[PDB]
């Protein structure tokens, strides 16, 4: 992904 480390509950 473009932001692979982001926790799943973060972002849209």
């Amino acid at each position, epitope marked *: 992904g*473009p*932001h*692979p*480390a*982001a*926790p*799943s*509950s*973060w*972002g849209p």
Partner: antibody
Amino acid sequence: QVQLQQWGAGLLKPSETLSLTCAVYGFSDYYWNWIRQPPGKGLEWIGEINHNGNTNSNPSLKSRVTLSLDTSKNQFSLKLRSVTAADTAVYYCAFGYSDYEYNWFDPWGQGTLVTVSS
Amino acid sequence: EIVLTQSPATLSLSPGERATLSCRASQSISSYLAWYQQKPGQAPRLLIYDASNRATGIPARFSGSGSGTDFTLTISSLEPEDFAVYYCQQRSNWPLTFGQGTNLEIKR
């Protein structure tokens, strides 16, 4: 309601192998992290194992790191090989997770002070 | 690595004043920034995640904004409990990195 415990030997001589363990007591997407903080300095990330099994280490630790997770005991642990005085720091375990409603949490443990010296 | 640059190094203020803290990332991290507070002798404590969301129980005078590279933490009216060191952290990509920290001290 989550509680963190960490343990491991804190007094080491140079070139020994640090070994810390962290356990959680009390959620499905979780993010186990190790961070360390040398005295009087800022935070330096060590590594993460997440609930998908992604495993990553700080490149500055130069392949001296091993991360592991015993998912039966819920025990996250760290190995750091060939330690020098430069690895003296408080080592924190952090357990990031979100609950049944997409609220995010990241409690940190109390830390193990590790002193590497002859 | 993604480098986070916080500013200022030290913020010297008294209770009741507004505090603005900056964390700029070396490349776009979308909104995947978190802010932690650390007092002497304690582990860091999560305040804001995903740039703008307070963690449960964090008071409303703590506000986070930003998306892309420039992020801001605002404490609109300082309480004596708020004086401490503040770190940002990015969770866009490994390795996870922190800013160097901003010290928020009482001006006397």
